[PDB]
Amino acid sequence: DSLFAGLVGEYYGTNSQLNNISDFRALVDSKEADATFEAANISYGRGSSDVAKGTHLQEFLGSDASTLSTDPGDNTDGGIYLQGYVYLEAGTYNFKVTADDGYEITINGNPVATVDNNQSVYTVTHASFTISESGYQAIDMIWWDQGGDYVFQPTLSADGGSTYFVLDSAILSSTGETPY
Ligand SMILES: O[C@@H]1[C@@H](O)[C@@H](O)CO[C@H]1O
Ligand SMILES: [Ca+2]
Ligand SMILES: [Ca+2]
Ligand SMILES: [Ca+2]
Ligand SMILES: [Ca+2]
Ligand SMILES: [Ca+2]
Numbered sequence: 001d002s003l004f005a006g007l008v009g010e011y012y013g014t015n016s017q018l019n020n021i022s023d024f025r026a027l028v029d030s031k032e033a034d035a036t037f038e039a040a041n042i043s044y045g046r047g048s049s050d051v052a053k054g055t056h057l058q059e060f061l062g063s064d065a066s067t068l069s070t071d072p073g074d075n076t077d078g079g080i081y082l083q084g085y086v087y088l089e090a091g092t093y094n095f096k097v098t099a100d101d102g103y104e105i106t107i108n109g110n111p112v113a114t115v116d117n118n119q120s121v122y123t124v125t126h127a128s129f130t131i132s133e134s135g136y137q138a139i140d141m142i143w144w145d146q147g148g149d150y151v152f153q154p155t156l157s158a159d160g161g162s163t164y165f166v167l168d169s170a171i172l173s174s175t176g177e178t179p180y
């Protein structure tokens with residue numbers, strides 16, 4: 001398990017339709033990842049013409065694509081599963097996520113941002129949640145594209161929604177140890 005300032009990323013493609021969270025999670029369960037990568041700057045897309053075709057995944061992942069384990073072949077539909085840790089002080093936070101299609105983010109195993117359906121690009125300000133103890137918190141994310149356009153940018157606020165930040169190498173850890 002390598003130590004890096006990012007989340008462990010897995011990409012999965014399929015030629016079946018992804019309509020909701022359950023469909024993507026079942027894809028993840030069904031096989032080994034089509035590619036792995038380091039998710040160090042979680043602000044992906046936008047692009048067009050299906051994330052799972054050609055080099056669209058590379059374009060979507062941008063600054064993280066150089067860590068891809070392989071170049072997946074074509075599929076119609078696809079998505080990502082990210083997992084690891086995020087340093088957060090105790091306090092109150094909320095996500096604001098821009099996405100096409102849907103997604104789910106969990107912290108310490110509890111959902112904190114959910115869109116359980118397909119959608120063209122849309123930004124949701126999610127409800128707040130609490131962190132009870134400062135440190136590295138467990139975090140995971142799924143996102144998918146059913147086809148067409150694709151974008152995924154979760155941002156996080158620690159100040160009641162006045163300012164938001166991207167999750168990146170400043171605060172992410174793949175294993176929960178401090179990355180240097
Ligand atoms: O990206 C597409 C968008 O272009 C629209 O067709 C609605 O579904 C989304 O998945
Ligand atoms: Ca799997
Ligand atoms: Ca490809
Ligand atoms: Ca980019
Ligand atoms: Ca859970
Ligand atoms: Ca589809």
Ligand SMILES: [Ca+2]
Binds near residue numbers: 145146147149
């Ligand atoms: Ca789409």
